[PDB]
Each structure stands twice: as C-alpha cells, then as structure tokens.
Design a protein around this motif. Structure first.
Motif, PDB file in Angstrom:
ATOM      1  N   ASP A 159       0.824  -1.215   0.000  1.00 39.39           N
ATOM      2  CA  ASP A 159       0.000   0.000   0.000  1.00 39.39           C
ATOM      3  C   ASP A 159       0.847   1.250   0.000  1.00 39.39           C
ATOM      4  OD1 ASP A 159      -2.438  -1.416  -0.011  1.00 39.39           O
ATOM      5  OD2 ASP A 159      -2.756  -1.179   2.144  1.00 39.39           O
ATOM      6  N   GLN A 160       1.886   1.240   0.829  1.00 40.85           N
ATOM      7  CA  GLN A 160       2.807   2.363   0.913  1.00 40.85           C
ATOM      8  C   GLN A 160       3.518   2.611  -0.401  1.00 40.85           C
ATOM      9  OE1 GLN A 160       4.911   0.844   4.348  1.00 40.85           O
ATOM     10  NE2 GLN A 160       4.152   2.502   5.634  1.00 40.85           N
ATOM     11  N   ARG A 161       3.960   1.531  -1.031  1.00 44.26           N
ATOM     12  CA  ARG A 161       4.639   1.621  -2.318  1.00 44.26           C
ATOM     13  C   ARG A 161       3.697   2.169  -3.376  1.00 44.26           C
ATOM     14  NH1 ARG A 161       7.132  -3.724  -0.989  1.00 44.26           N
ATOM     15  NH2 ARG A 161       9.199  -3.091  -0.206  1.00 44.26           N
ATOM     16  N   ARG A 162       2.455   1.682  -3.434  1.00 42.23           N
ATOM     17  CA  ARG A 162       1.524   2.171  -4.441  1.00 42.23           C
ATOM     18  C   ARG A 162       1.314   3.672  -4.299  1.00 42.23           C
ATOM     19  NH1 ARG A 162      -2.355  -0.335  -2.829  1.00 42.23           N
ATOM     20  NH2 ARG A 162      -1.887  -2.492  -2.167  1.00 42.23           N
ATOM     21  N   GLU A 163       1.163   4.143  -3.077  1.00 41.88           N
ATOM     22  CA  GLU A 163       0.955   5.555  -2.823  1.00 41.88           C
ATOM     23  C   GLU A 163       2.181   6.351  -3.251  1.00 41.88           C
ATOM     24  OE1 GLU A 163       0.706   6.480   1.459  1.00 41.88           O
ATOM     25  OE2 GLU A 163      -1.057   7.692   0.999  1.00 41.88           O
ATOM     26  N   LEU A 164       3.372   5.849  -2.913  1.00 40.97           N
ATOM     27  CA  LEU A 164       4.600   6.556  -3.294  1.00 40.97           C
ATOM     28  C   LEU A 164       4.810   6.604  -4.805  1.00 40.97           C
ATOM     29  CD1 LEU A 164       6.679   5.386  -0.311  1.00 40.97           C
ATOM     30  CD2 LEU A 164       6.691   7.787  -1.115  1.00 40.97           C
ATOM     31  N   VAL A 165       4.555   5.501  -5.495  1.00 40.46           N
ATOM     32  CA  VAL A 165       4.676   5.482  -6.955  1.00 40.46           C
ATOM     33  C   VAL A 165       3.775   6.554  -7.576  1.00 40.46           C
ATOM     34  CG1 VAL A 165       4.191   4.141  -9.029  1.00 40.46           C
ATOM     35  CG2 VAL A 165       5.432   3.133  -7.125  1.00 40.46           C
ATOM     36  N   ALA A 166       2.540   6.625  -7.112  1.00 37.85           N
ATOM     37  CA  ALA A 166       1.594   7.607  -7.637  1.00 37.85           C
ATOM     38  C   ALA A 166       2.098   9.024  -7.375  1.00 37.85           C
ATOM     39  CB  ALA A 166       0.212   7.397  -7.023  1.00 37.85           C
ATOM     40  N   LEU A 167       2.615   9.273  -6.185  1.00 35.23           N
ATOM     41  CA  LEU A 167       3.134  10.593  -5.832  1.00 35.23           C
ATOM     42  C   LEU A 167       4.351  10.984  -6.684  1.00 35.23           C
ATOM     43  CD1 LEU A 167       3.112  13.054  -3.866  1.00 35.23           C
ATOM     44  CD2 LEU A 167       4.526  11.661  -2.365  1.00 35.23           C
ATOM     45  N   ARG A 168       5.381  10.143  -6.684  1.00 38.17           N
ATOM     46  CA  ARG A 168       6.621  10.495  -7.363  1.00 38.17           C
ATOM     47  C   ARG A 168       6.505  10.533  -8.883  1.00 38.17           C
ATOM     48  NH1 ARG A 168       8.060  12.436  -2.461  1.00 38.17           N
ATOM     49  NH2 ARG A 168       8.753  10.795  -1.078  1.00 38.17           N
ATOM     50  N   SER A 169       5.499   9.889  -9.428  1.00 37.32           N
ATOM     51  CA  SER A 169       5.341   9.912 -10.872  1.00 37.32           C
ATOM     52  C   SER A 169       4.927  11.288 -11.406  1.00 37.32           C
ATOM     53  CB  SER A 169       4.389   8.821 -11.309  1.00 37.32           C
ATOM     54  OG  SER A 169       4.985   7.538 -11.091  1.00 37.32           O
ATOM     55  N   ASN A 170       4.606  12.229 -10.518  1.00 34.00           N
ATOM     56  CA  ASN A 170       4.531  13.630 -10.903  1.00 34.00           C
ATOM     57  C   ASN A 170       5.936  14.237 -10.816  1.00 34.00           C
ATOM     58  OD1 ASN A 170       3.458  16.164 -11.580  1.00 34.00           O
ATOM     59  ND2 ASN A 170       3.211  16.691  -9.448  1.00 34.00           N
ATOM     60  N   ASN A 171       6.652  14.235 -11.944  1.00 32.15           N
ATOM     61  CA  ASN A 171       8.066  14.590 -11.992  1.00 32.15           C
ATOM     62  C   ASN A 171       8.484  14.634 -13.432  1.00 32.15           C
ATOM     63  OD1 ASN A 171       9.934  15.071  -9.720  1.00 32.15           O
ATOM     64  ND2 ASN A 171       9.152  13.154  -8.905  1.00 32.15           N
ATOM     65  N   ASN A 172       9.583  15.322 -13.722  1.00 37.19           N
ATOM     66  CA  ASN A 172      10.136  15.375 -15.063  1.00 37.19           C
ATOM     67  C   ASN A 172      11.296  14.378 -15.110  1.00 37.19           C
ATOM     68  OD1 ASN A 172      11.951  16.081 -17.219  1.00 37.19           O
ATOM     69  ND2 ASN A 172      10.513  17.765 -17.630  1.00 37.19           N
ATOM     70  N   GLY A 173      11.144  13.299 -15.868  1.00 39.22           N
ATOM     71  CA  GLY A 173      12.175  12.269 -15.891  1.00 39.22           C
ATOM     72  C   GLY A 173      13.513  12.794 -16.342  1.00 39.22           C
ATOM     73  N   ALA A 174      13.529  13.729 -17.299  1.00 43.65           N
ATOM     74  CA  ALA A 174      14.806  14.251 -17.782  1.00 43.65           C
ATOM     75  C   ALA A 174      15.533  15.041 -16.695  1.00 43.65           C
ATOM     76  CB  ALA A 174      14.600  15.120 -19.014  1.00 43.65           C
ATOM     77  N   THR A 175      14.810  15.880 -15.938  1.00 40.84           N
ATOM     78  CA  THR A 175      15.494  16.732 -14.974  1.00 40.84           C
ATOM     79  C   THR A 175      15.839  15.917 -13.747  1.00 40.84           C
ATOM     80  OG1 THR A 175      13.468  17.661 -13.958  1.00 40.84           O
ATOM     81  CG2 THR A 175      14.319  18.752 -15.884  1.00 40.84           C
ATOM     82  N   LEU A 176      15.027  14.907 -13.415  1.00 43.78           N
ATOM     83  CA  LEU A 176      15.430  13.972 -12.347  1.00 43.78           C
ATOM     84  C   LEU A 176      16.725  13.285 -12.740  1.00 43.78           C
ATOM     85  CD1 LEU A 176      12.265  12.094 -11.014  1.00 43.78           C
ATOM     86  CD2 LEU A 176      13.384  14.124 -10.059  1.00 43.78           C
ATOM     87  N   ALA A 177      16.799  12.813 -13.986  1.00 37.23           N
ATOM     88  CA  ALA A 177      17.993  12.121 -14.451  1.00 37.23           C
ATOM     89  C   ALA A 177      19.215  13.003 -14.346  1.00 37.23           C
ATOM     90  CB  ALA A 177      17.806  11.668 -15.876  1.00 37.23           C
ATOM     91  N   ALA A 178      19.071  14.259 -14.748  1.00 33.75           N
ATOM     92  CA  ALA A 178      20.209  15.198 -14.696  1.00 33.75           C
ATOM     93  C   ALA A 178      20.668  15.401 -13.259  1.00 33.75           C
ATOM     94  CB  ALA A 178      19.852  16.528 -15.325  1.00 33.75           C
ATOM     95  N   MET A 179      19.732  15.588 -12.337  1.00 28.95           N
ATOM     96  CA  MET A 179      20.119  15.798 -10.946  1.00 28.95           C
ATOM     97  C   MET A 179      20.691  14.542 -10.306  1.00 28.95           C
ATOM     98  SD  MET A 179      20.556  17.729  -8.395  1.00 28.95           S
ATOM     99  CE  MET A 179      20.181  18.191  -6.742  1.00 28.95           C
ATOM    100  N   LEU A 180      20.149  13.382 -10.650  1.00 30.57           N
ATOM    101  CA  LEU A 180      20.622  12.112 -10.082  1.00 30.57           C
ATOM    102  C   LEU A 180      22.112  11.953 -10.373  1.00 30.57           C
ATOM    103  CD1 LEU A 180      20.107   9.509  -8.634  1.00 30.57           C
ATOM    104  CD2 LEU A 180      19.352   8.454 -10.740  1.00 30.57           C
ATOM    105  N   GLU A 181      22.498  12.193 -11.621  1.00 28.95           N
ATOM    106  CA  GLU A 181      23.899  12.103 -12.002  1.00 28.95           C
ATOM    107  C   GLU A 181      24.728  13.191 -11.303  1.00 28.95           C
ATOM    108  OE1 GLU A 181      24.591  11.339 -16.141  1.00 28.95           O
ATOM    109  OE2 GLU A 181      26.703  10.919 -15.685  1.00 28.95           O
ATOM    110  N   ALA A 182      24.232  14.423 -11.330  1.00 27.89           N
ATOM    111  CA  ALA A 182      25.023  15.562 -10.850  1.00 27.89           C
ATOM    112  C   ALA A 182      25.385  15.450  -9.378  1.00 27.89           C
ATOM    113  CB  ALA A 182      24.286  16.860 -11.095  1.00 27.89           C
TER     114      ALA A 182
END
Ligand SMILES: O=C(O)CCC(=O)C1=CC=C[C@@H](O)[C@@H]1C(=O)O
Length: 252
Positions: A159-182
């Motif tokens: 249940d916790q995972r489902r809620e978190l997936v729904a929440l975090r999926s509001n995000n820009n994958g490209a800018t997350l990717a850039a920050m993850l690396e940086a």
C-alpha cells in the motif's frame, strides 16, 4: 537565479528551518512535519531538477550549495537550521561543510556521509547511470515501482509503495535524471572527518527499520535519534515521532 521554495513566516527573530527533500521529492515532503513548528519560520525548498526548480540544472554539489546560498539571501534568512532527508541530507552536509553564513545546525535523516573507496564509487556510478537511462526512457510509474523495491525501501508494504509510486510519478524524468547524475553519491567526498570537526551542531535521524542508515549513523560523531516503527523515510511514516525528535533537538 534562486531555487523555487515556499516560505512560511513564524515569530520574528526565531530561526528559520530550511527543509530539503530527497530524490524525486519536492517542497511538500517536509510540510507535514515542518508546519508543527509554527513559531519558527519555514523554507520548503525545491532542489535542482525537482518541483518548481526542475529547469535549474547543476553540474555538481558546488552549484547546489551556491544556489542554496543565493536562495537564503533572497529570503533574508540570517539564522537557520538545515534539515535534509536522504539526498537532501547529503546536500545539507555538503553545503554545511563548504560553509553557509548563519547556519546554526544541521539535521540529517538517512543521509549518506560518503563512500570510502574507488570500488564502491564505481558501483554507484554504474547503478546511477542505469537509473538515469530508465528516467530518460520509461514510464515513471514503472521506474518508481522498481525504485521503491530497492533495499533501502524493503521495509515498505504494498500500500505504501503504491501511494509513493503515484506521488513520485509527478516529476520530469529528464530533470530527475540530470540531478541524479550531478549529485550522485559516487561524486560525493567522504565527509566523516569534516563532520567530526564541525563548528555547527549536527544531528542524525534514522528510522528504526532502516538497517543501512542505522549502521552509518553509528560511524558518525552525531547524536542519533532512532524513529520508532519507521523505515528510511521516517518523517513520512512516523511524522509525530520525527516532530518529537526535532523538538528535543531545537528547543534545547
Ligand atoms: O525517498 C526516495 O524515493 C528517495 C530518497 C533519496 O534521496 C535517495 C534514495 C536512495 C539513493 C539516492 O538516490 C538518494 C540518496 O542519496 O539518499
């Protein structure tokens, strides 16, 4: 250029609490906890690549610290605590160690103080490179379904995972990717010696069920507060417990 943030004004003269979310989070992350400290002023920051700071790119921690410094000045913040969860904890430790004018203390929840050899750094570099490619190419609901099955999130229930997936999926994958690396842990110095010699107050929070970060906290020269019945994101799972720990830290 400054970071997007939400400011809440408390009693004039009391410190600011400057809250930094973790990877894939945004400025709402700490608000359930932070708004309990209604007498303090609160700054809820969006890190580069996240929330309203999506379009702010950085090459590494120096750039993030500089952006944080400029943001604090813009909000006329002179006396403050930095409170960071996970990636936000690592940003907090890096900024504090590099130097932030008016910092009175740092509180880190599940922030890694740094890897200690080239093998570990290579492994993390490779692993983060794989996540970067996923964030650039896949549905975020699929990427986050795997994200929240990483070992640090083993303790979560479905249940916790489902809620978190729904929440975090509001995000820009490209800018997350850039920050993850940086700001990858692979490029972070080992801050243990610097934290030992700190001028600033330093406190560590860890969920009871977060085995990795309980072990890390033990390596550090900080008071560690173990949050009952909580995993890695302890403030999300046990906000009342984290509020109590923050109150003990701040009001003494
Ligand atoms: O809460 C989350 O989904 C992620 C928390 C977070 O910031 C991190 C989780 C695991 C690895 C890293 O990318 C990062 C960290 O640096 O702590």
């Amino acid at each position: 250029m400054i970071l997007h943030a939400q400011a809440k004004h408390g009693k004039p003269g009391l410190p600011w609490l400057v809250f930094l979310h973790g990877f894939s989070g945004d400025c709402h992350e700490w608000q359930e906890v932070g708004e309990a400290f209604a007498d303090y002023s609160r700054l809820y920051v969006d890190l580069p690549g996240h929330g309203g700071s999506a379009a702010i790119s950085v090459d590494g921690f120096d750039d993030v610290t500089d952006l944080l410094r400029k943001t604090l000045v813009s909000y006329n913040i002179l006396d403050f605590w930095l409170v960071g969860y996970s990636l936000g904890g690592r940003v907090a430790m890096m900024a504090a160690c590099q130097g932030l004018a008016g910092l009175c203390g740092v509180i880190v929840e599940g922030g890694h103080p740094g890897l200690q050899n080239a093998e570990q750094r290579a492994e993390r570099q490779r692993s983060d490179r794989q996540w970067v490619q996923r964030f650039l190419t896949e549905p975020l609901t699929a990427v986050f379904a795997d994200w929240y099955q990483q070992p640090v999130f083993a303790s979560l229930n479905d249940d916790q995972r489902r809620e978190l997936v729904a929440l975090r999926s509001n995000n820009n994958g490209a800018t997350l990717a850039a920050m993850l690396e940086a700001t990858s842990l692979a490029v972070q110095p080992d801050l243990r010696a610097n934290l030992s010699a700190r001028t600033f107050a330093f406190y560590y929070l860890c969920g009871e069920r977060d085995s990795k970060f309980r072990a890390l906290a033990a390596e550090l020269a900080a008071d560690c507060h173990v949050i009952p019945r909580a995993g890695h994101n302890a403030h999300r799972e046990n906000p009342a417990g984290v509020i109590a720990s923050l109150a003990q830290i701040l009001r003494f």
